[PDB]
Amino acid sequence: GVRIGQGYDIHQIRVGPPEKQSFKRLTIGGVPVETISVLSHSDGDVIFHALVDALLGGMSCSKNSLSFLRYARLLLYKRNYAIANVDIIVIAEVPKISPIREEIVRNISSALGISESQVSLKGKTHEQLGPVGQKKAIECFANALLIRKQ
Amino acid sequence: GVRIGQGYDIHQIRVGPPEKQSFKRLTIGGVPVETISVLSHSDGDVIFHALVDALLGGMSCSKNSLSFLRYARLLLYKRNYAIANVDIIVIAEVPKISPIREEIVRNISSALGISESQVSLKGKTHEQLGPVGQKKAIECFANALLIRKQ
Amino acid sequence: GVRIGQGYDIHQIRVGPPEKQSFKRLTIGGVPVETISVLSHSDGDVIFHALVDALLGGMSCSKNSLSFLRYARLLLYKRNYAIANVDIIVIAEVPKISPIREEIVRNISSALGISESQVSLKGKTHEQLGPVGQKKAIECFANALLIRKQ
Ligand SMILES: [Zn+2]
Ligand SMILES: [Zn+2]
Ligand SMILES: [Zn+2]
């Protein structure tokens, strides 16, 4: 009883502060970035969205996305799975991930009831290439390993 | 004896019905989509191709791609591995994955001799960005966990 | 004690021989490709970079990149983890991966102290689409499974 899960998300961004879909303040990993706007239906959290998708995929299931991340916590418990670890990559020209990394990791640890040592997070630029390189978009690939209790 | 596998595929598409490589009726997850054409050597199944690649990668190995997926089934048995689960992401503006999801999942379950509950499949748009966002391409990332028998 | 790790890298390339960042001879998987230049700070090894990132992510940690790959070897031993396997995808119009695949696999086996049978490597083109399809870039997605000793 070991399972892999995988998730992906992309949103269009703009470098302004902000002032179906509209341009709002970026949220990423539950962390506001008041200097970037995001085009989204929801809060447009590429990290929480792709991570939530990773955890449901691990279990062969399908605006504030902290809500989704807490439900995933309850679904994992209902289905008898524990997280071994999760590993997250943001591909983004901006924002830099390093300054807010400890915070995001804390937001994810917390919300899923795991330790900070079960969460890895890394930012890569797109080397100024394509929509992501030109600051038009951000994406996230998230991976989860799950273990059947117990 | 636990192994990760990973695979990737991209093909150029056009929104027409169709009428080395040529434009044909799209196949995705073994499911025809008569309203999209695909540029391919083979049937151009981004799902079966990346999934087959995931399962060989799991095992450190290298026109109808259902054929490849059945051989992978025999190679896994020859090499003494079972699939724990597989998790698949299609990144495509079109086609929508939801309408054909149950069918694809059935085609994959069947062909590999696993249950529908060991297969996860999810569609994401590319938020209208780049060749994929403009309906010029579709891609797929596939993940596999394997377990040594027995 | 089983862990997933994931890594990603992209660099701008040019098809010339070459004669913060500058254009140099491409290195990929520790293998020089004297017919392609790479834009990089370091040697610009998309494979060693993303693989190193995969192995640290597996462990919830953060110019010659063979050096990074050897440290990862020591960090894994210090943290009491063994590699089950690694699976690598290069997405590149050029170079072809097949000719240099055995060599790269040998460079990775060697440097991490695992067998060639624990390493999978695969090249995909980007079907001539976008910066990667136009030979402006190359990328790599790397996956690792780790197992607690012992
Ligand atoms: Zn989203
Ligand atoms: Zn193909
Ligand atoms: Zn690099």
Automatic annotation (TrEMBL), chains A, B, C:
Instruction: Give a GO molecular function annotation for the protein.
Output: metal ion binding
Keyword annotations of the record: Isoprene biosynthesis, Lyase, Membrane, Metal-binding, Transmembrane, Transmembrane helix, Zinc
| Cofactors, names only | a divalent metal cation
Q: What is its EC number?
A: 4.6.1.12
Keyword Zinc listed? The answer is: yes
Q: What class of enzyme is it?
A: lyase
Q: What catalytic activity does the UniProt entry give for this protein?
A: 4-CDP-2-C-methyl-D-erythritol 2-phosphate = 2-C-methyl-D-erythritol 2,4-cyclic diphosphate + CMP
Give the residues the record marks as binding Zn(2+). 9, 11
> To which pathway does this protein belong?
Isoprenoid biosynthesis; isopentenyl diphosphate biosynthesis via DXP pathway; isopentenyl diphosphate from 1-deoxy-D-xylulose 5-phosphate: step 4/6
- Provide the 2-C-methyl-D-erythritol 2,4-cyclodiphosphate synthase domain boundaries: 2-146
GO BP terms in the entry: isopentenyl diphosphate biosynthetic process, methylerythritol 4-phosphate pathway; terpenoid biosynthetic process
User: What is stated as this protein's family in its record?
Assistant: Belongs to the IspF family.
Q: What protein name does the entry list?
A: 2-C-methyl-D-erythritol 2,4-cyclodiphosphate synthase
Q: What is the lineage of its organism?
A: Eukaryota, Sar, Alveolata, Apicomplexa, Aconoidasida
**Complete-protein stretch covered:** 104 to 286 of 287
